[PDB]
């Protein structure tokens, strides 16, 4: 992977990528204005880190989010595309870091950095099964 | 609202809140291994805070996540209870800042700050629809 390489992913947000969608079990959430919801813009952060390292992974990896850190400066109604722009800060071992940075067409929305740990998926799958009550 | 005071959050994490449930529209996550996401924790402890503040608001008013920076530092599968524990570390006019951290009973599983701003509820919709297409 090449340190400072831009990826971006766009993705046109639905009427069930607000707020009230993230968590329909809260009543809280339930009055919130039909915007996209933070928890969603982290997955879609995510989502486009997990799309610029595919290539280089070997067979059987994957990924999981160790942090995220990041602004929300604007709001997103359903119907405009938010485009993630992620780019690589480092690399070490199993660790790759990530600027993040999120744009509604409108109004830049969100920005920050994420990380994430490089996974054998089967491996880390059986730990998980371990844990599960 | 007093700074220091801790309010806390228990959820039962239910299969539908791993990761392949955030973005059905992702063959990405199609196939990830069945761990709380991320997306979901920044959700849930957004929703811990939204509660903690609920004394503040005026009528006619809500709150918006403005950042949220957290570590995720293990993963948990559906069947265990989440705990967040929000704990209030500013409050100024509109703007409210918490150290939230996360437990899933088993393990700690990330912890970090979370911002949020108070809003004019009709005000801000009116300015969400401005940019609806």
Not at 23 to 32: K, L, R, T, V
Request: charged share 25%; glycine share 8%.
């Amino acid at each position: 992977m090449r340190v400072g390489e831009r990826f971006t992913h766009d993705f046109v947000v639905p009427p069930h990528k607000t707020v009230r969608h993230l968590y329909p079990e809260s009543p809280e959430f339930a009055e919130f204005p039909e915007v996209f919801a933070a928890g969603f813009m982290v997955g879609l952060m995510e989502w486009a880190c997990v799309r610029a390292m595919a290539p280089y992974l070997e067979p059987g990896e994957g990924s999981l989010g160790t942090a995220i850190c990041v602004t929300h400066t604007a709001a997103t109604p359903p119907g405009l595309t938010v485009t993630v722009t992620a780019e690589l800060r480092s690399v070490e071992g199993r660790r790759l870091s990530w600027r993040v940075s999120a744009h509604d067409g409108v109004d830049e929305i969100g920005s920050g950095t994420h990380e994430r740990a490089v996974i054998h998926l089967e491996k880390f799958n059986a730990k998980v099964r371990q844990k599960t009550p």
